[PDB]
Design a protein around this ligand. Structure first.
Ligand SMILES: Nc1ncnc2c1ncn2[C@@H]1O[C@H](COP(=O)(O)O)[C@@H](OP(=O)(O)O)[C@H]1O
Ligand SMILES: C[C@]12CC[C@@H]3c4ccc(O)cc4CC[C@H]3[C@@H]1CC[C@@H]2O
Ligand code: NA
Length: 292
């Protein structure tokens, strides 16, 4: 029944569990044609995609806030593999888009369309500690259409540890992108670093994107992309979406925006179980995360 629910909502593509709506048109994703100046923003879901996207968009627009608010973020920065009737078609939206394109994806690097690798496109990868990701993803299941009932948080965390959620194992995702992040064309970032010292990360992003980091530009980005601003900005908070797609009365997209909400969700027993499993999955990696 829970399992039946998951069966109805998700199916695999290249071994990765995926939203069924996306899979139907996966040939369009597979065959997607990149352009050399495309920039990819890749993340495991609920890792701060929207946050870094808006930072990047600001950098592209030299901090012109009006330009950033002209259309909603999912139109400004198309969601590559996404496909929903009329509202979203990432491939279509990207095809018609003038360059320079910013491309959002949640794909593991093994599933990124070959054209992006072939054209040597720059990629920004952002990750977030798994426990906080799990919390954020849980509420996402609750409030967004296309998800099964996630049950209780402990039940959901069991599915998360097994990678039985859309986009698959968080563990394999971050580890694979960490290996890619050694390339000079791939910038590897942490949500917790953006929380701790936003100015440092913004400046890093500006240099990676080969633009000039003035104090005024950096200050405009920092306040424009702060959680309190983005929460109330209808271009970035997904509130233009109808309730039957995202029911933000249940849980808002811009939910809390902190590091450490896991502490308010994991029980002592669940934390012990998770931590032990995590160490087994991650011990052979030089990738290290902070949970506070
Ligand atoms: N400007 C910002 N500052 C801090 N966190 C942000 C943010 N914009 C979005 N987030 C957080 O990033 C998560 C959404 O990620 P994504 O864009 O990849 O779907 C949510 O986490 P929480 O549910 O823990 O609040 C959301 O609150
Ligand atoms: C496309 C949907 C709305 C947008 C949703 C979204 C929106 C943003 C994001 O980063 C991930 C996802 C995954 C699930 C998507 C949903 C699955 C069905 C629904 O129509
Ligand atoms: Na790199």
């Amino acid at each position: 029944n829970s399992e039946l629910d998951y069966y109805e909502k998700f199916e695999e593509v290249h071994g990765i569990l995926m939203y069924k709506d996306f899979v139907k048109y996966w040939d369009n994703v597979e065959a997607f044609q990149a352009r050399p100046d495309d920039l990819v923003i890749a993340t495991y879901p609920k890792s701060g995609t929207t946050w870094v996207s808006e930072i990047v968009y600001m950098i592209y627009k030299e901090g012109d806030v009006e330009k950033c608010k002209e259309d909603v973020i999912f139109n400004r920065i198309p969601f590559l593999e996404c496909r929903k009737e009329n509202l979203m078609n990432g491939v279509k939206q990207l095809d018609e888009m003038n360059s320079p394109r910013i491309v959002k994806t949640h794909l593991p690097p093994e599933l990124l369309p070959a054209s992006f690798w072939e054209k040597d496109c720059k990629i920004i990868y952002l990750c977030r500690n798994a426990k906080d990701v799990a919390v954020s993803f849980y509420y996402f299941f609750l409030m967004v259409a296309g998800h099964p009932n996630p049950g209780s948080f402990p039940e959901f965390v069991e599915k998360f540890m097994q990678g039985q959620v859309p986009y698959g194992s968080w563990y394999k995702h971050v580890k694979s992108w960490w290996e890619k992040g050694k390339s000079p064309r791939v910038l590897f970032l942490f949500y917790e670093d953006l929380k701790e010292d936003i100015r440092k990360e913004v400046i890093k992003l500006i240099h990676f994107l080969e633009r000039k980091p003035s104090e005024e530009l950096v200050d405009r980005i920092i306040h424009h992309t702060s959680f309190q601003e983005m929460k109330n900005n209808p271009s970035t908070n997904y509130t233009t979406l109808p309730d039957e797609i995202m029911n933000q009365k249940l849980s808002p997209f811009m939910r809390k925006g902190i590091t450490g909400d896991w502490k308010n969700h994991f029980t002592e027993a669940l934390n012990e179980k998770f931590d032990k499993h995590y160490e087994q999955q991650m011990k052979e990696s030089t990738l290290k995360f902070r949970t506070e």
